[PDB]
Predict the 3D structure of the following.
Amino acid sequence: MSPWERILLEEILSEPVRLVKERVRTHTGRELTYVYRPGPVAASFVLPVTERGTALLVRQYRHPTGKFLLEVPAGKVDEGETPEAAARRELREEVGAEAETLIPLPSFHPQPSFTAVVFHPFLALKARVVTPPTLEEGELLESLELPLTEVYALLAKGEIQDASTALTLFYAEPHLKRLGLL
Amino acid sequence: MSPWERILLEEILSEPVRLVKERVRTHTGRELTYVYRPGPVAASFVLPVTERGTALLVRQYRHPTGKFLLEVPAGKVDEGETPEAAARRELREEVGAEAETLIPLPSFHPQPSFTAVVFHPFLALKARVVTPPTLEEGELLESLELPLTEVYALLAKGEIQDASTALTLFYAEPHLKRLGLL
Ligand SMILES: Nc1ncnc2c1ncn2[C@@H]1O[C@H](COP(=O)(O)CP(=O)(O)OC[C@H]2O[C@@H](O)[C@H](O)[C@H]2O)[C@@H](O)[C@H]1O
Ligand SMILES: Nc1ncnc2c1ncn2[C@@H]1O[C@H](COP(=O)(O)CP(=O)(O)OC[C@H]2O[C@@H](O)[C@H](O)[C@H]2O)[C@@H](O)[C@H]1O
Ligand SMILES: [Mg+2]
Ligand SMILES: [Mg+2]
Ligand SMILES: [Mg+2]
Ligand SMILES: [Mg+2]
Ligand SMILES: [Mg+2]
Ligand SMILES: [Mg+2]
């Protein structure tokens, strides 16, 4: 029961990102061209907290912004993979870490005006580094460790620029306080 | 001092959204094709709160997701427009409302892996409807009014799916409590 009717869907690019340009007939009966990254597609974001109340984060180059951003480890959910499995896999690839319990947090659409992608945040407990990272060609980042108090001070000061990381931290906060880690 | 060198930048689309495919030489010295929405580009998001402690929100169709989402009014910052002016303009266009003070909240990148866009959140005080909305062709939404207690209950329950709206609410919360509106 979509309010907009498909006239024609054109694929603008298939790789490395799929992008479409769709001609639709809108609620006004007129035509409009809408450009977007089609679904279904998802990514998992994971805040890895150690038993010492610290977080394992990454400082990662994000080319579209030209900046290195402080982020929680994250990555695309592969075909047939569950969000939790992608979270654990990306945590191992980007930080070389494993964790015990993963508490799922509220999923969200980072930019629904342009992409169908759903981001799945998780709070990983008893995180620990166990192996060297295995980064993809295209991934330029370094992992670091910060006390949770410092990470949340950065959040309060408005210094966390990556939206997904900021939101994951806000959703994780009550759990961290409940568990006695913050 | 970018870690990646431009080999060639190709424009994939110019309108309604500008998209590029850039061939770069990475930190490994190898080539990679990176697809993204180039900057500089920005949008403003504004949580409009009334003197009665209610919020003026929108339920808007977001085609890439196929869903109607509960969001704060928001829109692109036009050429030569300041983020605050875009916030006031979009608030008037989408909800037919005006406000007094606008408190700027921490800016953020909704999806730095794909777009350079910076989102600028604001908390607008003494919001009030004064005129009919003036929606663009392509904008399918309705405005509504909800008590702040209900909006924040939805946030806590993980029911706010739009990331930018969720983050704006989290950043606005301390200000609302300070001002006595929550
Ligand atoms: N826009 C792009 N264009 C070309 N190549 C790209 C792009 N985005 C990511 N890559 C490649 O993603 C890799 C392994 O990535 P994730 O660790 O899986 C990816 P993560 O990068 O942390 O991102 C999460 C998300 O933001 C959204 O754009 C995505 O849906 C998403 O997965 C890198 O080596 C990048 O070069
Ligand atoms: N991907 C798209 N493809 C084709 N047409 C589009 C697209 N996105 C928005 N529009 C048009 O934006 C209008 C006026 O929009 P905003 O009220 O200005 C826009 P807002 O829609 O609320 O969005 C804020 C943001 O999310 C990010 O994608 C943007 O940078 C951004 O501005 C609508 O009528 C849409 O059809
Ligand atoms: Mg990643
Ligand atoms: Mg990956
Ligand atoms: Mg990765
Ligand atoms: Mg809008
Ligand atoms: Mg606009
Ligand atoms: Mg608008």
In short: The pocket of magnesium ion (ligand 8) is lined by residues B 75, 90, 93-94, 136, 139 (CB under 6 Å). Chain A touches chain B through 58 residues (CB under 8 Å). Residues 1-182 of chain A form a domain with the Nucleoside Triphosphate Pyrophosphohydrolase fold (CATH 3.90.79.10).
